[PDB]
C-alpha cells in the first residue's frame, strides 16, 4: 500500500555564536592632588 505519515520533528538546533567584546571601560579617575 501507499506510504505512511511523516516522522516527528528532529533535534533542537545547536548553540549560537558568541557575542562581541564589550564596550571599553569608562575613563580612569584623575590623579588627585
Amino acid at each position: 500500500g501507499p506510504p505512511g505519515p511523516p516522522g516527528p520533528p528532529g533535534p533542537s538546533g545547536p548553540r549560537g555564536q558568541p557575542g562581541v567584546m564589550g564596550f571599553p571601560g569608562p575613563k580612569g579617575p584623575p590623579g588627585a592632588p
Partner: protein, 214 residues
C-alpha cells in the same frame, strides 16, 4: 548513529567494533582553529594553546603525573607577558573592580528579561542602586552577588582556587593586578577566600557583611 551521544569535555563520539556509540579522547588536531586571538588559552607554563578544546583533548588523555600536577590552565587569551602588580596599583584596584562589578550588574539589569539573569529581589536592589544622579552605598550588593556566583563547588562560604577560574582566567590578561589581588584577599592564607576575607578585600566594613546577599 551518534548525534544522540554527548561526551564530557575533551571526548568525542567514535563507534566501537559493534557499531555502538562510545566515547574516546579527542584528536586535538581536529578542533576549530581560533576564530581570532581570543579563542586561545594560556597555561601554567607560559605555553599557548589554540582553544579550550585544544587544552582538553591534550589534557584528556592524561592523569596522575607530578610534572603535570603543577600544570593547569591559567587564563584566556594567548600567552603574553604580565607586568608586576605594583603596590600603588594593587591598592587602586579593589576600587576599580568593585566599580566594574556595579556596572557588570547594571549591564545585566538591562539584559534580564524574566529573572534569567537576576532574581526579582536583586533586580530591585539594582533598581534602588541605579537611580542615582548623586560612593560606598552601592558596591555592597555587587561584591556579594559576585561572590554568590563563584562559591559553588561546593557551596560552603569559601572560594577554592578552582572556584575563581571563571573570573581569574578571563581577567588576568586585562588586569595584571588580578592574580595578586586574589591571593592577598585570603588574609589568613587558608588557600581559600571566605566571605569576610572577600568583602574586606573590596573595602567593605564588616558591619555591612550581610551573609544573605549571596
Amino acid at each position: 548513529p551518534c548525534q544522540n551521544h554527548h561526551c564530557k569535555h575533551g571526548k568525542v563520539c567514535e563507534l566501537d567494533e559493534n557499531n555502538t556509540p562510545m566515547c574516546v579522547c579527542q584528536d586535538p588536531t581536529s578542533c576549530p582553529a581560533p576564530i581570532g586571538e581570543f579563542e586561545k588559552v594560556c597555561s601554567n607554563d607560559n605555553k599557548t594553546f589554540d582553544s579550550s578544546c585544544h587544552f582538553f583533548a591534550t589534557k584528556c588523555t592524561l592523569e596522575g603525573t607530578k610534572k603535570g600536577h603543577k600544570l593547569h590552565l591559567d587564563y584566556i587569551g594567548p600567552c603574553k607577558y604580565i607586568p608586576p602588580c605594583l603596590d600603588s596599583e594593587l591598592t587602586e584596584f579593589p576600587l576599580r573592580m568593585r566599580d566594574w562589578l556595579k556596572n557588570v550588574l547594571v549591564t545585566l539589569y538591562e539584559r534580564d528579561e524574566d529573572n534569567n539573569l537576576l532574581t526579582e529581589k536583586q533586580k530591585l536592589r539594582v533598581k534602588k542602586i541605579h537611580e542615582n544622579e548623586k560612593n560606598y552605598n552601592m558596591y555592597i550588593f555587587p561584591v556579594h552577588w559576585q561572590f554568590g556566583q563563584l562559591d559553588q563547588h561546593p557551596i560552603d562560604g569559601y572560594l577554592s582556587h578552582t572556584e575563581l577560574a571563571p573570573l581569574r582566567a578571563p581577567l588576568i590578561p586585562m588586569e595584571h593586578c588580578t592574580t595578586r589581588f586574589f591571593e592577598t584577599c585570603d588574609l589568613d592564607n587558608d588557600k581559600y577566600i571566605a566571605l569576610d576575607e572577600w568583602a574586606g578585600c573590596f573595602g567593605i566594613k564588616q558591619k555591612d557583611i550581610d551573609k544573605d546577599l549571596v
